[PDB]
């Protein structure tokens, strides 16, 4: 299923995922689509930061949901 | 491997060049190791600040090539870039449109 | 032939990051080059004069700052000194 | 809430970026201190006047000591109580005054000394730790009935560790860090000491999770260590992490501060002439990332509030109080349920359909509250309210 | 599939046609070409710019686009087969329909859908046929289009005239003052980027004409899939004698049929859905189950009518 | 409601063709003096200093640029002087006052 990842810059990417995928798998999917290393990003949904170890289905995410990707920017 | 001294500071303008010019231009007996970096930063800041207005002018004039008239406009339309260049004359820059009010018909 | 130098490629690298699609002419490039040279000479000459009154024997990153703050007008001075000190910090810690 | 609804792009900025308001104090400000939550601002004026502004109005709400017992000369420390009720202050009048903010007409308790004060600090119970001018030992005042007790040059700044409130830290006038273990009531033996500089230590700040520490020497440098404690409060070591300074004009520092919990940012205020700005570095890499550029005068003190996420600092020449806060712009996108705003022309894709015209029982919990917000600030903590005094309202 | 690069495509109500040097003509210098080939094929003048190429498609990211058959079906009985995320549509449409819009989005065209074989007209979908047999990737769809004799359409048009002259009108006088068998065409020679094309005015959408709704007498649209008919798509086909050309009435008021009126077989392409249309009996597969002439015959007839009218109109 | 858009004999009295030449020259940026007369004038003036110089073709041009950007600017100032004296014409006693105030005569 499709979910959305809205980047600050104005870009929204339409990732394809399954509800049984882990969030780590989601970060890997964002990488392999866009090349951003999972360590440098930060994913936000419904005001709560998605916790590193848990799974996508832990947050009841279903298809065509949108969620925000902010970068832990540095030098 | 080598690493350009102007890339360690996020600059585009050359720092080794500016340093060699400060050294061999007879400005002082000794040149601090961070003076060329500061000076190159200031130079690129000024040139970006003027090139931005020049591009804005060349775009608001439906062209896509900065041209001396656009630099003259970008400078003389500002208020502080006008004092920095109050004495210069920009070749092929023309003049700024202006007509006095006593002359305009009634 | 003898190779002379200029600031063409650097002005171009700055234009290609302020307006990523515009392109400069030739006479305008020579104008920007002579502008850079003129401001360079102004700033370095004032910095020298200032590193002379004080009897120092060197022209450091603070003579340059005071020169920039004397020559440049009201608001260009603050932004110029900010960019300068940012560059010098980013350079010294590397 | 008002943040959960906001978009998590303009609300999750890492630190203030612009100044918004500039409080003017009739007297001259000398100390700033928010309440434990971003509710009240307890200012200590020039002549012992002590006001408590409210951050919702920026205008005063309570002047303790209006009946009696107020302070008479420059105040030097203002420490709140974790709940919000009690408030400790100390001035150059040698007196330490604890006020119960439920009856702010007069001081609740107070003690007097034989020398001016540098700073008082809370412990719970009710016991404060104080540093006196020119003395070489701290003071434990466990004044529920007003007793006072005592515990390398001098002692300037003290601070209690955040995770282990038995540990105490103190900096000397000669370069020595000295640690103490409050293993008792009025008998404390050191557990560690060392000397890192040849000049006076002026500030000792520690992150909220004891995993960092910073030090402002009289030398124009800032020493940042990564402290750690263990072994029933016996294991203690320091590892130099970074040194910050002003590479251009070698200015001095007036005050320093960290971020909230992991202390991913360090905020410092410069002291020399022509110095009007605040520096903001990281702490992992240590590289400069921001320079707050709002004021027009030497800035003495700093205070960060993580709930409203604002930096507050008092000027020196004038006496004003400038505030740099995160600013969120109004989004027209909210005016309707489906008004999504874009920045660039988006392309449109159409299905073949568009040209061709033509119970619930979800989990609902209304009595449960939310513990943490987007930023990560702990709600549900007791937030005592200063009682409004009506007597000074009729006129 | 390739796109056209230097051809004027039909747009803004103008139609183009290539010509070749004909020295028998003195007033005009050129006469119509047969085609870039012998047989009838895809009319390149009235295509969308995005319509790529007897084979037509659009890229997989492009909205509904259409092409029309060159031959104009005026009357009689004509049969043919069209060979078949990527959708397509098969149908018939008049000239007023836009090449940008899917056949059946307006009131001037009637079409059918690839998925579920639903009939599309006036932008509304229909499921008149109860068979509901799905269409596969290699199916051949036959079309039998029967239209009334020219004389009855002419008399229906004359009835429309007799109503309009005073019954619908009671500058009125000028309108009341305003040839059915006779064809009068308008053609100007133009040169576009060193190439040579004829410019002709086209028709505009107007209010639907009403009185009972206008219907071609005993008009019928029949559809077959592999020999099996799936019903009659439409009966009450619109008359066209009803079809006002784009006209600057202001100009002539201030100063004070083109042989191409009919329904064209139209193929629509969506997100890469390709297809092809069959014209000639040798590659016709169900020509005998009707019992008739193929489209190619009417192609040759149109060629003859055009060249003869070109002959007469010289003087 | 509809889609908005951006698109869908004679004798001029004295003083109007002037106000049009002003607008058409204040926007152009070419040189307003013929090139061969200025060539010859520069060559003739440089006789009084050294007999036979060769005047590289970019020197002459250079001079011309300055020689415009001076005169033009001068006229601006003189204009004000005229408008100051409550008139519209510019007279030789205006140019002299501009050059005096400005420092070129003292």
Selecting from D247, D286, D287 the residue whose C-beta is nearest the C-beta of C88 gives D247
| Angle CA E214–E215–E221, to nearest 5 | 150
Chain C and chain E touch, per 3+ beta carbon pairs within 8 A: no
Tell me the C-alpha distance between D45 and D73, whole Å: 9
Two structure tokens written together for D147: 């007793």
Tell me the C-alpha distance between D158 and D138, whole Å: 8
Tell me the C-alpha distance between C39 and B46, whole Å: 9
Two structure tokens written together for F50: 């050294």
CA distances from D56 to D53, D163, D308, D330 (A): 9, 32, 11, 19
> What CATH number has the domain bearing residue C83?
1.10.20.10
Long-range own/partner contacts, residues E6-12 (CB < 8 A, 24 or more apart): E6/E193, E6/E195, E7/E44, E7/E45, E7/E195, E8/E45, E8/E192, E8/E197, E9/E44, E9/E45, E9/E46, E9/E47, E9/E48, E9/E49, E10/E45, E10/E46, E10/E47, E10/E99, E10/E202
Tell me the C-alpha distance between E276 and E69, whole Å: 11
Evaluate the CA torsion angle E33, E38, E39, E44 in order and state its sign. Answer: negative
3-state SS assignment for residue E225: strand
Q: What is the DSSP letter of A55?
A: B
Nearest-Å Rg of the Cα atoms of chain A is 11
CA distances from F93 to B4, F68, F97 (A): 61, 21, 6
| Angle CA D21–D27–D32, to nearest 5 | 55
For helices B15-24 and C27-53, the axis angle rounded to 10 degrees is 50
- On whether the CB atoms of residues E123 and E106 are closer than 8 A, the answer is yes
Mutate to test the interface with D, among E59, E60, E61, E64 (most CBs of D within 10 A): E64
Q: Is residue F24 part of a domain?
A: yes
Q: Which CATH superfamily is domain B1-106 in?
A: Histone, subunit A (1.10.20.10)
Residues 6+ apart with CB under 8 A from F32: F25, F68
Chains adjacent to D (≥3 CB pairs closer than 8 angstroms): A, C, E
Half-sphere exposure of C64 (CA within 13 A, CB side): 34
Conformational region of residue F75, where left means phi above 0, alpha means psi within -120 to 50, and beta covers everything else: alpha
DSSP assignment of C23-40, as one string?
A: EE-SHHHHHHHHHHHHHH
Tell me the C-alpha distance between E49 and E26, whole Å: 35
Number of structural domains found in chain C: 1
Nearest chain E residue to D356 by CA distance is E123
Q: Is residue F23 part of a domain?
A: yes
Instruction: Tell me whether B11 touches chain C (CB under 8 Å).
Output: yes
Q: What is the DSSP letter of A58?
A: G
The residue numbers preceding gaps of C to N over 2.5 A in chain E are 53, 84, 170, 178, 211, 241, 256, 291
Q: Answer whether C89 sits within 8 Å of D287, measured CB to CB.
A: yes
HEC assignment per residue over chain D = CCCCCCCCCCCCCCCCCEEEEEECCCCCCCECCECCCCCEEEEECCCCCEEEEECCCCCEEECCCCCCCCCCCCEEEEEECCCCCEEEEEECCCEEEEEECCCCCCCCEEEECCCCEEEEECCCCCCEEEEECCCCCEEEECCCCCCCEECCCCCCEEEECCCCCCEEEEECCCCEEEEEECCCCCCCCEEEEEECCCCCEEEEEECCCCCCEEEEECCCCEEEECCEEECCCCEEECCEEEEECCCCCCCCEEEEEECCCCCCCEEEEECCCCCCCEEEECCCCCCEEEEECCCCCCECCCEEECCCCEEEEEECCCCCEEEEECCCCCCHHHHCCCCCCCCCCCCCCCCCCCCCCCCCCCCCCCCCCCCECCCCCECCCCCCCCCCCCHHHCC
Q: Answer whether D288 sits within 8 Å of C61, measured CB to CB.
A: no
Tally of CB atoms within 10 A around A60: 10
CA distances from D208 to D35, D83, D123, D160, D165 (A): 16, 17, 15, 11, 12
Based on the number of CB atoms within 10 Å of its own CB, is B89 exposed (0-12), middle (13-18) or buried (19 or more)?
Answer: middle
Q: Answer whether D373 sits within 8 Å of A47, measured CB to CB.
A: yes
The residue numbers preceding gaps of C to N over 2.5 A in chain A are none
| Angle CA E57–E58–E63, to nearest 5 | 130
Q: Taking CB atoms and an 8 Å cutoff, what residues of chain C touch D293?
A: 78, 82
Q: Taking CB atoms and an 8 Å cutoff, what residues of chain D touch E105?
A: 355-356
The minimum CA-CA distance between B22 and chain F, rounded to whole Å, is 29
Q: What is the DSSP letter of E12?
A: T
3-state SS assignment for residue E1: coil
3-state SS assignment for residue B61: coil
Q: Answer whether A46 sits within 8 Å of D4, measured CB to CB.
A: yes
* Window C:6-35, CB contacts with B under 8 Å: 7, 10-11, 13-15, 17-19, 21-25, 27-28, 31-32, 35
Resolution in A: 3.4
Half-sphere exposure of E95 (CA within 13 A, CB side): 32
Nearest chain B residue to F72 by CA distance is B95
Number of structural domains found in chain F: 1
Residues 6+ apart with CB under 8 A from C74: B80
Selecting from B50, B66, B90 the residue whose C-beta is nearest the C-beta of C25 gives B66
* Window B:36-95, CB contacts with C under 8 Å: 37-52, 54-55, 58-59, 64-68, 70-71, 80-81, 83-85, 88, 90-92
Q: Answer whether E123 sits within 8 Å of D357, measured CB to CB.
A: yes
- On whether the CB atoms of residues F74 and F95 are closer than 8 A, the answer is yes
In 3D, which of D217, D200, D223, D211 has the Cα closest to residue D153?
Answer: D200
Domain boundaries, chain D: 15-328
Mutate to test the interface with C, among D242, D247, D274, D285 (most CBs of C within 10 A): D247
Mutate to test the interface with A, among D2, D5, D7, D8 (most CBs of A within 10 A): D8
Range of the domain at C27: 1-94
Residue pairs spanning A and D at CB distance below 8 A = 27
DSSP assignment of E51-99, as one string?
A: -B---BB--TT---EEEEESS-B-SEEEEEEEE----EEEEEE-TTS-T
Q: What is the DSSP letter of E166?
A: I
Q: Taking CB atoms and an 8 Å cutoff, what residues of chain D touch A47?
A: 3-4, 8, 373-374
- Alpha-carbon torsion, ordered F67, F70, F76, F79, to 10 deg: -70
Chains adjacent to E (≥3 CB pairs closer than 8 angstroms): D
Q: Answer whether C88 sits within 8 Å of D293, measured CB to CB.
A: no
Across the strands, what pairs with D139? D130, D150
Of how many residues is chain B composed? 106
């Amino acid at each position: 299923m499709q979910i959305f990842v809205k980047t600050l810059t104005g870009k929204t990417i339409t990732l394809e995922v399954e509800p049984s995928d882990t969030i780590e798998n989601v970060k890997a999917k964002i990488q392999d689509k866009e090349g951003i290393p999972p360590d440098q990003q930060r994913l936000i949904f419904a005001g709560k930061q998605l916790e590193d170890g848990r799974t996508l289905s832990d947050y009841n995410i279903q298809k065509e949901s949108t969620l925000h990707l902010v970068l832990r920017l540095r030098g | 491997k080598a690493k350009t001294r102007s890339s360690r500071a996020g600059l585009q303008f050359p720092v080794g060049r500016v340093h060699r010019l400060l050294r061999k231009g007879n400005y002082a007996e000794r040149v601090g190791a961070g003076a060329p970096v500061y000076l190159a930063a200031v130079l690129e800041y000024l040139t970006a600040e003027i090139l931005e207005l020049a591009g804005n002018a060349a775009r608001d004039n439906k062209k896509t090539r900065i041209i001396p008239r656009h630099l003259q406009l970008a400078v003389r339309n500002d208020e502080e870039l006008n004092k920095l260049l109050g004495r210069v004359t920009i070749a092929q820059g023309g003049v700024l449109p202006n007509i006095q009010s006593v002359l305009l018909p009634k | 032939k003898t190779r002379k130098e200029s600031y063409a490629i650097y002005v171009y690298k700055v234009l290609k990051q302020v307006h990523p699609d515009t392109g400069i002419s030739s006479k305008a490039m020579s104008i920007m080059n002579s502008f850079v040279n003129d401001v360079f000479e102004r700033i370095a000459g004032e910095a020298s004069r200032l590193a002379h009154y004080n009897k120092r024997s060197t022209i450091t990153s603070r003579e340059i700052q005071t020169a920039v703050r004397l020559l440049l007008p009201g608001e260009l001075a603050k932004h110029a000194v900010s960019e300068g000190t940012k560059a010098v910090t980013c350079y010294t810690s590397a | 809430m008002n943040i959960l609804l906001q978009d998590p792009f303009a609300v999750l900025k890492e630190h203030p970026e612009k100044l918004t308001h500039t409080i003017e104090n009739p007297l001259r400000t000398e100390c700033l201190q928010f309440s434990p939550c971003g509710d009240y601002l307890a200012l200590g004026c020039a002549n012992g006047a002590l006001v408590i502004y409210d951050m919702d109005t920026f205008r005063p709400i309570c002047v303790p000591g209006n009946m009696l017992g107020a302070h008479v000369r420059p105040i030097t420390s203002i420490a709140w109580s974790p709940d919000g009720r009690l408030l400790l202050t100390s001035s150059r009048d040698w007196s330490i005054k604890l006020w119960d903010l439920s009856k702010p007409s007069k001081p609740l308790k107070e003690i007097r000394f034989d020398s001016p004060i540098w700073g008082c600090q809370w412990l719970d119970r009710r016991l404060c730790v104080a540093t006196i001018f020119e003395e070489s030992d701290a003071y434990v005042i466990d004044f529920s009935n007003d007793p006072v007790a005592s515990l390398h040059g001098y002692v300037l700044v003290c601070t209690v560790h955040t995770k282990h409130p038995n540990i105490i830290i103190v900096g000397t006038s000669k370069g020595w860090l000295d640690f103490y273990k409050f293993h008792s009531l009025y008998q404390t033996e050191c557990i560690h000491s060392l000397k890192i500089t040849s000049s006076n230590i002026k500030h000792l700040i520690v992150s909220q999770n004891g995993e960092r520490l910073a030090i402002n020497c009289s030398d124009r440098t800032i020493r940042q260590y990564e402290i750690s404690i263990d072994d029933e409060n016996s294991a203690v070591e320091l590892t130099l992490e970074h040194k910050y300074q002003d590479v251009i004009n070698k200015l001095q520092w007036n005050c320093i501060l960290f971020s909230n919990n992991t202390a991913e940012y360090l905020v410092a205020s410069t002291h020399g002439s022509s110095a009007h700005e605040l520096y903001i570095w990281e702490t992992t890499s240590g590289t400069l990332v921001r320079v707050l550029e709002g004021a027009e005068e030497e800035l003495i003190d700093i205070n960060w509030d993580f709930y409203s996420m604002s930096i507050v600092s008092n000027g020196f020449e004038s006496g004003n109080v400038y505030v740099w806060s995160v600013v969120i712009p109004p989004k027209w996108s909210a005016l309707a349920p489906d008004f999504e705003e874009v920045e660039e022309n988006v392309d449109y894709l159409e299905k073949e359909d568009e040209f061709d015209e033509v119970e619930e029982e979800i989990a609902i919990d209304l009595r449960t509250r939310e513990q943490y917000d987007v930023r990560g600030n702990n709600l549900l903590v007791e937030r005592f309210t200063i009682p409004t005094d009506y007597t000074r309202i009729i006129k | 599939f390739v796109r056209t690069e230097d051809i004027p495509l039909n747009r803004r109500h103008f139609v183009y046609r290539p010509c070749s040097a004909n020295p028998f003509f003195t007033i005009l210098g050129y006469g119509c070409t047969e085609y870039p080939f012998d047989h009838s094929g895809m009319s390149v003048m009235d295509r969308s710019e995005g319509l790529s190429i007897d084979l037509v498609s659009v890229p997989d990211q492009y909205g509904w686009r259409t092409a029309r058959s060159d031959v104009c079906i005026k009357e009689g009985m004509t049969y043919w087969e069209v060979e078949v995320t990527p959708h397509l549509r098969f149908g018939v449409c008049r000239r007023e329909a836009s090449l940008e819009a899917p056949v059946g989005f307006d009131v001037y065209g009637y079409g059918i859908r690839d998925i579920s074989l639903e009939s599309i007209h006036e932008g509304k979908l229909n499921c008149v046929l109860e068979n509901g047999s799905p269409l596969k990737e290699g199916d051949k769809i036959g079309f039998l289009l029967s239209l009334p004799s020219i004389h009855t359409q002419i008399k229906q048009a004359k009835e429309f005239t007799k109503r309009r002259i005073f019954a619908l009108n009671s500058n009125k006088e000028f309108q009341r003052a305003l040839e059915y068998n006779d064809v009068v065409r308008d053609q100007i020679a133009i040169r576009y980027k060193n190439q040579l094309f004829f410019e002709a005015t086209d028709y505009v959408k107007t209010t639907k004409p009403e009185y009972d709704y206008y219907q071609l007498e005993d008009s019928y649209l029949a559809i077959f899939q592999n020999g099996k008919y799936l019903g009659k798509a439409f009966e009450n086909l619109k008359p066209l004698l009803f079809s006002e050309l784009q006209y600057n009435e202001k100009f002539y008021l201030g100063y004070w049929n083109n042989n191409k009126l009919g329904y064209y077989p139209t193929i629509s392409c969506f997100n890469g859905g390709t297809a092809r249309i069959i014209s000639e009996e040798d590659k016709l597969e169900y020509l005998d189950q009707i019992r008739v002439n193929t489209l190619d015959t009417l192609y040759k007839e149109q060629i003859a009518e055009d060249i003869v009218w070109d002959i007469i109109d010289e003087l | 409601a509809r889609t908005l858009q951006t698109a869908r004999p004679h004798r001029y009295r004295p003083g109007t063709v002037a106000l049009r030449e002003i607008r058409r020259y204040q926007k152009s940026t070419e040189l307003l003096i013929r090139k061969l007369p200025f060539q010859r004038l520069v060559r003739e003036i440089a006789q009084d200093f050294k007999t036979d110089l060769r005047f590289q073709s970019s020197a002459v041009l250079a001079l011309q640029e300055a020689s415009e950007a001076y005169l033009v600017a001068l006229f601006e100032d003189t204009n004000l002087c005229a408008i100051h004296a409550k008139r519209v014409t510019i007279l030789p006693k205006d140019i002299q006052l501009a050059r005096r105030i400005r420092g070129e005569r003292a």
